[PDB]
Ligand binder design. Structure first.
Ligand code: CA
Lengths: 121, 139
């Protein structure tokens, strides 16, 4: 069971995907690759759909000032996530469905630095 | 003189086609790297740096790190210290001392020191940077 999706991310505004009525014992797989621009993929899975923008914004506001804070916030927002598990900066995720019900998949952009003259997440 | 460069080594056991140089991998392995049996060789380097009025930000590039390696750095005159990769994605932050461990196949690191003259000490596979003792060793 394989499905494809394509989208566009603007200024760290993510896209939610719905997984209706999964069964306990199922295994979810995810992979996200960059096809244009400077996007750095991030993927997370959760039960109740809530916008991570308000929580992730505080991480940018506090500018291990980046990695530890991002990990601590992600371990609260999501049940499972991956940043750079694939080839390059691409993400890959394996998640065993805990109980019976529906879940949500969140795709978006992580917080990164891409300069060597100064530090600016 | 001696010579330097990269090489490819093919080893065979009771496989007479190896001497042709075209032996494809087969069977179950029989030999392994010897260096993995002991502790890795440390490299230590010390630098003196100065942050002028117009040069308050400084960056340095490191050589490539193999997977499983470790990185240590410390500064003693306090400025801020952090570590990022070549793109710049942050990896560690100073507590001044810093520590990191290599996960990817090839890691290229950049050390940021930003704020006067300071001493910067850096080492690879050398957790003893607090009390080195030996003069800077290795490459
Ligand atoms: Ca990533």
């Amino acid at each position: 069971r394989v499905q494809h999706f394509t989208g566009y991310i603007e200024d760290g505004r993510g896209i939610f995907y719905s997984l209706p009525d999964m069964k306990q014992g199922d295994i979810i797989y995810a992979s996200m690759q960059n096809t244009g621009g400077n996007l750095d993929p991030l993927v997370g899975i959760m039960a109740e759909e809530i916008d991570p923008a308000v929580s992730l914004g505080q991480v940018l506001e506090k500018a291990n000032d980046l990695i530890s804070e991002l990990t601590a916030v992600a371990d609260r927002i999501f049940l499972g996530w991956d940043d750079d598990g694939g080839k390059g900066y691409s993400a890959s995720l394996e998640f065993t469905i805990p109980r019976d019900g529906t879940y949500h998949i969140f795709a978006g952009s992580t917080i990164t630095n891409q300069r060597l003259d100064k530090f600016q997440p | 003189t001696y010579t330097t460069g990269s090489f490819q080594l093919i080893l065979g056991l009771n496989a007479p086609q190896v001497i042709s140089g075209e032996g494809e991998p087969e069977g179950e392995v029989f030999a392994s790297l010897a260096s993995l049996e002991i502790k890795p060789e440390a490299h230590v380097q010390e630098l003196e740096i100065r942050l002028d009025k117009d040069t308050r930000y400084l960056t340095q590039h490191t050589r490539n790190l193999q997977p499983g390696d470790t990185f240590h750095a410390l500064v003693e005159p306090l400025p801020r210290l952090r570590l990022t990769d070549s793109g710049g994605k942050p990896l560690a932050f100073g507590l001044v001392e810093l520590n990191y461990t290599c996960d990817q196949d090839i890691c290229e690191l950049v050390v940021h020191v930003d704020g006067a003259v300071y001493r910067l000490l850096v080492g690879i596979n050398a957790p003893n940077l607090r009390e080195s003792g030996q003069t800077p060793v290795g490459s």
